[PDB]
Design a protein around this ligand. Structure first.
Ligand SMILES: Nc1nc2c(ncn2[C@@H]2O[C@H](COP(=O)(O)O)[C@@H](O)[C@H]2O)c(=O)[nH]1
Ligand SMILES: [Mg+2]
Ligand SMILES: [Mg+2]
Ligand SMILES: [Mg+2]
Ligand SMILES: [Mg+2]
Ligand SMILES: [Mg+2]
Ligand SMILES: [Mg+2]
Ligand SMILES: [Mg+2]
Ligand SMILES: [Mg+2]
Ligand SMILES: [Mg+2]
Ligand SMILES: [Mg+2]
Ligand SMILES: [Mg+2]
Ligand SMILES: [Mg+2]
Ligand SMILES: [Mg+2]
Ligand SMILES: [Mg+2]
Ligand SMILES: [Mg+2]
Ligand SMILES: [Mg+2]
Ligand SMILES: [Mg+2]
Ligand SMILES: [Mg+2]
Ligand SMILES: [Mg+2]
Ligand SMILES: [Mg+2]
Ligand SMILES: [Mg+2]
Ligand SMILES: [Mg+2]
Ligand SMILES: [Mg+2]
Ligand SMILES: [Mg+2]
Ligand SMILES: [Mg+2]
Ligand SMILES: [Mg+2]
Ligand SMILES: [Mg+2]
Ligand SMILES: [Mg+2]
Ligand SMILES: [Mg+2]
Ligand SMILES: [Mg+2]
Ligand SMILES: [Mg+2]
Ligand SMILES: [Mg+2]
Ligand SMILES: [Mg+2]
Ligand SMILES: [Mg+2]
Ligand SMILES: [Mg+2]
Ligand SMILES: [Mg+2]
Ligand SMILES: [Mg+2]
Ligand SMILES: [Mg+2]
Ligand SMILES: [Mg+2]
Ligand SMILES: [Mg+2]
Ligand SMILES: [Mg+2]
Ligand SMILES: [Mg+2]
Ligand SMILES: [Mg+2]
Ligand SMILES: [Mg+2]
Ligand SMILES: [Mg+2]
Ligand SMILES: [Mg+2]
Ligand SMILES: [Mg+2]
Ligand SMILES: [Mg+2]
Ligand SMILES: [Mg+2]
Ligand SMILES: [Mg+2]
Ligand SMILES: [Mg+2]
Ligand SMILES: [Mg+2]
Ligand SMILES: [Mg+2]
Ligand SMILES: [Mg+2]
Ligand SMILES: [Mg+2]
Ligand SMILES: [Mg+2]
Ligand SMILES: [Mg+2]
Ligand SMILES: [Mg+2]
Ligand SMILES: [Mg+2]
Ligand SMILES: [Mg+2]
Ligand SMILES: [Mg+2]
Ligand SMILES: [Mg+2]
Ligand SMILES: [Mg+2]
Ligand SMILES: [Mg+2]
Ligand SMILES: [Mg+2]
Ligand SMILES: [Mg+2]
Ligand SMILES: [Mg+2]
Ligand SMILES: [Mg+2]
Ligand SMILES: [Mg+2]
Ligand SMILES: [Mg+2]
Ligand SMILES: [Mg+2]
Ligand SMILES: [Mg+2]
Ligand SMILES: [Mg+2]
Ligand SMILES: [Mg+2]
Ligand SMILES: [Mg+2]
Ligand SMILES: [Mg+2]
Ligand SMILES: [Mg+2]
Ligand SMILES: [Mg+2]
Ligand SMILES: [Mg+2]
Ligand SMILES: [Mg+2]
Ligand SMILES: [Mg+2]
Ligand SMILES: [Mg+2]
Ligand SMILES: [Mg+2]
Ligand SMILES: [Mg+2]
Ligand SMILES: [Mg+2]
Ligand SMILES: [Mg+2]
Ligand SMILES: [Mg+2]
Ligand SMILES: [Mg+2]
Ligand SMILES: [Mg+2]
Ligand SMILES: [Mg+2]
Ligand SMILES: [Mg+2]
Ligand SMILES: [Mg+2]
Ligand SMILES: [Mg+2]
Lengths: 14, 122, 46, 97, 95, 166
RNA sequence: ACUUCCAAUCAGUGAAAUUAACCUUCCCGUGAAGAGGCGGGAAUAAAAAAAUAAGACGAGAAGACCCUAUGGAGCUUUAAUU
RNA sequence: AACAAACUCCUAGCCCAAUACCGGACUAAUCUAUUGAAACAUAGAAGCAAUAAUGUUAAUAUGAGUAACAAGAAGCCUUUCUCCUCGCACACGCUUACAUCAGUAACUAAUAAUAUACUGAUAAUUAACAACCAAUAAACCAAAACAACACUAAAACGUUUAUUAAUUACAUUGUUAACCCAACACAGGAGUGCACCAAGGAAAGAUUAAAAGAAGUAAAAGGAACUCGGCAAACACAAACCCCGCCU
RNA sequence: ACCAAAGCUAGCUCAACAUACUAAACAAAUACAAAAAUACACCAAAAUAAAAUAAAACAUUCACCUAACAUUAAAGUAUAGGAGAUAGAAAUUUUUAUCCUGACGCUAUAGAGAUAGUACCGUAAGGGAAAGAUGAAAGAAUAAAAUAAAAGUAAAAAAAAGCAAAGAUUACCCCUUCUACCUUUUGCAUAAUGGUUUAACCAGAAAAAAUCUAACAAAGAGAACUUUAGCUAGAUACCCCGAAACCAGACGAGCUACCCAUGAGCAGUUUAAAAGAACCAACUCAUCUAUGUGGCAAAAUAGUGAGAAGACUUGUAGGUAGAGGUGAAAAGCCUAACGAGCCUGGUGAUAGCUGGUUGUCCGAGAAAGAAUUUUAGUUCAACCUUAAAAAUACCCCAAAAACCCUAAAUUCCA
């Protein structure tokens, strides 16, 4: 299976 | 994405979105597509004559004020109708059925400036 | 090919899909508005 | 592990206020009073806990039975979920069986 | 076994134990030998008698059944013409 | 935050009794929240350590670093304060006894990388502390000579004791 | 062979995977069966800078191959209830 | 012989190892009831103790001052030279990021200079273009493609007649921008009408000219001998034989 | 010496009483594309809860599970149950008015998510924060006092050799000795897992039978019961994180799959041609190679390619929604993860599987026989621990234990 991990962005406030 | 807190005014849409800013209408659309303005729909400012008016926007500083006595319906009735009713009752000609001669209006649909429907802006 | 730009803005689509009238025209959208009101959202719809 | 650098204000607690002087004064109201009142009636607190004691599951069950008809929606939902979790844990989990 | 019921908060008992077991007040548990009604034509008279006889339970099984049952089944019963009233008590047990 | 380099300049000594040698003047100055980096400023601080103020200014004028001008301004301000406030004549009679660089309060930003990843970019700020002492610079330590090395070796040989013996 | 981008130095700004602590050699042998850390020997002033990738069973992803789970799910039926 | 233990003596004692599970005595830090009053005692309670969960949050280090990032030149200071050419407007979209003045120690520009991208104050987009801008019955088969006349796939786009359409200047709304969607001041994605410059901009922060890497140019004699394959490249850019799918 | 550290408040939590319960604002505009004064209508709709789980599987069953009758007992009784797991009444009994209500609850990683459902993240349903600290006076900032105590640095870079320490020593190294720590294993320095470090949070919970202590005792208990020394009371006990999944209802066709309306593009050359013809632009795709691989880019750049009047590309708007849609079937696409979307709720789902599980000292201390969809696990037995009763316990000479031959030696015994 083509498993991919989407990046998660840090909260903009910090 | 687009905003949600901002106000949805006529500047934020396409050409086909032409929303008014709150001004009252002044006419309709005529025959060949033009706008026909109705004279009666345009407000007419009833401005008095201030040439001989002896009052100014500010009062004298030493002028005394008065105790706050807001005008009530009871006071208005006592001032406008109570003396007439008392005099007529003393004379003996008082007619309870007919009160239109004393300023009472049984129906507001007749006169120009109606009170409950509020036919006048200001 | 390249993704990430799946949002192409358009006010007509935005208002016709998530507008106040669109929400209130169906019983489920009224429930959505009630849920947002209960949570205390500043904006109930677009 | 940083600890404060100043002396805290020493609490001037007195042992002879009204509550401390009259603490549990009528604890023997029955025994010394020709029984009419149990020491249960002197307990002030929730309605479902006056003169009663039980573990968490029994307390939740009693609260739901007694005052469950006046609880808020989320409070009643939380009580039901807690009752279910406690039932499952007590009747299906543990070591001594 | 339900250690804490959902209605009363009490401890429940399994009905199979009381349906197929009997407890004397001294703590012993009485039971019937398994297979005493199965294929009697195939068994010797001595084996049939052994199956018909009542038997007791050991300490582990007795404690298990005590755990499964509640305190209502360990009480002292004074029945009218009880067959096991003479066996309810234990005598001359030197331990 | 901590601010004690400012307060180190406000101490007052009791008057010196006659016959006591004159106490050299000590002047503490510092610049806070400099955009230039901590280690990069430490390099210049170490460069100008222990030399006369005029020599330090001479080096910092022709240094190509960005912090060279900041350190030069700090040194000039310290010299002016030493002449004016403190009773220090001979504005050229000061030497840099201490010259240190520390870190201040940083700012955290996002550095974009690719594939939707990111890093924590840190906007560095530094403090520069300088302490000047009135008087000629102390002489630099000379490398240990062969005679001194032999003397210490012989002394360590003579310091021996018979361990675990008595 | 020569140009440009790279590269190295100078000046400014300045991340990432990774990291038990390291004062982080070589050979033979031993050992959870392929040792920088054990044993027997050799080697051994200390620090930079630039390169090459043999090793750290290198980093990355709680192997996707294999097996187990009285763990799932998709599909097909001549599987069992319907 | 000697040297050689958790063995055994010697001198004192508090007088004999340990994993899973089991038992006991003390005890750190909180709250309460009574003591105490330079921080404790007896009791009763628990959110009652962290060198370890690819533990959560925050800050800090290593990698590392490393990878990476940028402004054509001179000049009288915004005037001339050297180069490359996606420019103007409308629609959709963002909403003041636009303009004037002033400041930039720091915050935005992945660095400065200063400024369309930061800060403050003050101003601004003016309708003729665009949006909202008649119904009810009837006559009406005969395409657009320079449309003369035709083909098939049979084709959006209209006047007139009759009945009613408040009738009377000036209504309302969009008018900035260097801009939108992609976390970013992103080498990507973006409809239409005009021309290929009369409009837009700058590949190089400054040096040196190590290795390795990317792109290009040229190369003696040979011309596929390389390689899975003539992949890539080339002063070539031609002709054939099969397998499988009829073909677009 | 920097970085930093410490306040005590904002406020929260749990109950009692309670008027009897969608607060204040509502001048105008607000369900036209909400906050847009103003035209001949149409309006309304109901149809069971399901499943995750337990029965060590799973089909009948599986308490609570947004429907009132509360409390003391009857009673976990009668009954209902693949009669298994479990579920579970009723008849009949008890309940005296009001104040005496605050806290052996928290103090900014705690207590509500909250300074706030706000910034921010998503098209939407939805998710969702962190951030405060001087003083009587800052109309006392040429401002005054307490800590200068974490990790990280500087003051002050290093000198053969070695889990970095210990024995020591006049003396830092030099000498001698020790294979980091948890977890899992028959066994780990192992090159098997985990961790850069600091600070703050993070994991054993129940009283049936039993043991101890105490009250009273043939009776005990403040009502309903138990009693052939028993009854009453108290103290001793049973963790945390993690799936793929399943069900229900919302939100999604602004990307993409296919349709429906409404528009727009294709310049030049060869051809009686606008021929699903040919060359080749704009334009649409993406054959091959090289860079790039935390990149310009969560799919790009350069070169090179295919189509380019059509089964063509494309703008705007509408429709089809998950037990489905759509599909020139690739089990493709349906808002960057689709053998079937995402969000919320069930939900603290469930894991015989992995990981973790926090003070000191002392005593004793275990390597497996039988069942079992069972051998990755449980329940018994044999061992072992903690208390209590007793009396024989191991070592064990004779004598004794099979018949064709048979060793080491066994069993039972003074
Ligand atoms: N089953 C069993 N395991 C043991 C026994 N003794 C030690 N173990 C196991 O052996 C490991 C520790 O090894 P040890 O320290 O005994 O050498 C642990 O996993 C422990 O549970 C035993 O007697 N029986
Ligand atoms: Mg948004
Ligand atoms: Mg508009
Ligand atoms: Mg527009
Ligand atoms: Mg007009
Ligand atoms: Mg997105
Ligand atoms: Mg991106
Ligand atoms: Mg960093
Ligand atoms: Mg880091
Ligand atoms: Mg790590
Ligand atoms: Mg070394
Ligand atoms: Mg070896
Ligand atoms: Mg050795
Ligand atoms: Mg060695
Ligand atoms: Mg040798
Ligand atoms: Mg290598
Ligand atoms: Mg190693
Ligand atoms: Mg390898
Ligand atoms: Mg590896
Ligand atoms: Mg694995
Ligand atoms: Mg694999
Ligand atoms: Mg497979
Ligand atoms: Mg199994
Ligand atoms: Mg299942
Ligand atoms: Mg069949
Ligand atoms: Mg010896
Ligand atoms: Mg000994
Ligand atoms: Mg205590
Ligand atoms: Mg704790
Ligand atoms: Mg800690
Ligand atoms: Mg990792
Ligand atoms: Mg940790
Ligand atoms: Mg660094
Ligand atoms: Mg540099
Ligand atoms: Mg490096
Ligand atoms: Mg570089
Ligand atoms: Mg440039
Ligand atoms: Mg924007
Ligand atoms: Mg501005
Ligand atoms: Mg800058
Ligand atoms: Mg414009
Ligand atoms: Mg450059
Ligand atoms: Mg080269
Ligand atoms: Mg080359
Ligand atoms: Mg060439
Ligand atoms: Mg050649
Ligand atoms: Mg060949
Ligand atoms: Mg060859
Ligand atoms: Mg080729
Ligand atoms: Mg050829
Ligand atoms: Mg060819
Ligand atoms: Mg074909
Ligand atoms: Mg053909
Ligand atoms: Mg099950
Ligand atoms: Mg289970
Ligand atoms: Mg299964
Ligand atoms: Mg199952
Ligand atoms: Mg259910
Ligand atoms: Mg039946
Ligand atoms: Mg069964
Ligand atoms: Mg908080
Ligand atoms: Mg420190
Ligand atoms: Mg050593
Ligand atoms: Mg070993
Ligand atoms: Mg083990
Ligand atoms: Mg193994
Ligand atoms: Mg190994
Ligand atoms: Mg190993
Ligand atoms: Mg493993
Ligand atoms: Mg390891
Ligand atoms: Mg571990
Ligand atoms: Mg690791
Ligand atoms: Mg008990
Ligand atoms: Mg199921
Ligand atoms: Mg649609
Ligand atoms: Mg669409
Ligand atoms: Mg053409
Ligand atoms: Mg063609
Ligand atoms: Mg390309
Ligand atoms: Mg090329
Ligand atoms: Mg091309
Ligand atoms: Mg072609
Ligand atoms: Mg062709
Ligand atoms: Mg299914
Ligand atoms: Mg389908
Ligand atoms: Mg197929
Ligand atoms: Mg297939
Ligand atoms: Mg998706
Ligand atoms: Mg779990
Ligand atoms: Mg198993
Ligand atoms: Mg021991
Ligand atoms: Mg056992
Ligand atoms: Mg014998
Ligand atoms: Mg014997």
């Amino acid at each position: 299976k083509k498993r991919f991990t989407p990046p998660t962005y840090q909260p903009k406030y910090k | 994405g687009a905003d949600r807190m901002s106000k949805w005014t006529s500047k934020r849409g396409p050409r086909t979105f032409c929303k008014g800013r709150g001004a009252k209408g002044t006419g309709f659309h005529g025959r060949d597509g033009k706008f026909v303005q109705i004279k009666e729909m345009i407000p007419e400012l009833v401005v008095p004559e201030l040439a001989g008016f002896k009052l100014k926007p500010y009062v004298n500083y030493r002028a005394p004020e008065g105790t706050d006595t807001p005008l009530t319906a009871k006071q208005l009735f006592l001032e406008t109708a109570a003396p007439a009713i008392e005099k007529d009752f003393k004379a003996g000609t008082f007619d309870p059925e007919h009160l239109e001669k004393y300023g009472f209006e049984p129906t507001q649909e007749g006169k120009l400036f109606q009170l409950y429907p509020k036919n006048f802006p200001r | 090919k390249a993704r990430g730009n799946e949002y192409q803005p358009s006010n007509i689509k935005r208002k016709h899909k998530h507008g106040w009238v669109r929400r209130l025209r169906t019983p489920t959208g009224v429930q959505v508005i009630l849920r947002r009101m209960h949570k205390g959202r500043k904006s109930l719809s677009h | 592990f940083h600890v404060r650098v100043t002396l805290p204000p020493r609490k001037v607690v007195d042992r002879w206020n009204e509550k401390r002087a009259m603490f549990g004064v009528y604890d023997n109201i029955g025994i010394l009073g020709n029984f009419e009142k149990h020491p249960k009636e002197l307990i002030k607190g929730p309605i479902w806990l006056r003169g009663w004691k039980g573990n968490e599951l029994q307390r939740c069950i009693r609260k739901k039975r007694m005052v469950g008809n006046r609880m808020f929606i989320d409070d009643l939902h939380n009580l039901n979920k807690r009752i279910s979790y406690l039932y499952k844990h007590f009747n299906r989990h543990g070591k001594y069986r | 076994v339900t250690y804490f019921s959902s209605r009363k908060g009490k401890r429940k008992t399994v009905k199979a134990v009381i349906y197929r077991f009997l407890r004397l007040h001294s703590g012993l548990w009485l039971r019937r030998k398994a297979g005493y009604k199965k294929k009697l034509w195939k068994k010797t008279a001595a084996r049939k008698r052994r199956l018909r006889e009542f038997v007791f339970c050991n300490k582990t099984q007795s404690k298990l059944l005590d755990k499964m049952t509640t305190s209502f089944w360990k009480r002292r019963n004074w029945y009218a013409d009880d067959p096991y009233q003479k066996y309810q008590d234990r005598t001359n047990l030197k331990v | 935050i901590s601010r004690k380099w400012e307060k180190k300049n406000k101490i007052v000594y009791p008057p010196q009794l006659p016959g006591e040698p004159r106490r050299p003047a000590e002047i503490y100055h510092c610049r806070r929240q400099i955009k230039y980096s901590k280690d990069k400023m430490w390099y210049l601080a170490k460069l100008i350590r222990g030399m006369s103020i005029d020599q330090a200014l001479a080096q910092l004028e022709f240094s190509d670093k960005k912090g060279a001008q900041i350190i030069k301004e700090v040194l000039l301000e310290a010299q002016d304060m030493a002449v004016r406030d403190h009773n220090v004549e001979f504005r050229s009679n000061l030497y840099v006894a201490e010259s240190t660089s520390g870190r201040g309060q940083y700012l955290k930003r996002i550095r974009y990388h690719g594939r939707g990843r990111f890093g924590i970019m840190e906007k560095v700020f530094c403090h520069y502390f300088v302490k000047l002492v009135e008087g000629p610079p102390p002489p630099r330590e000379a490398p240990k000579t062969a005679v001194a090395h032999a003397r210490e070796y012989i002394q360590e040989l003579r310091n021996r004791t018979i361990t675990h013996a008595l």
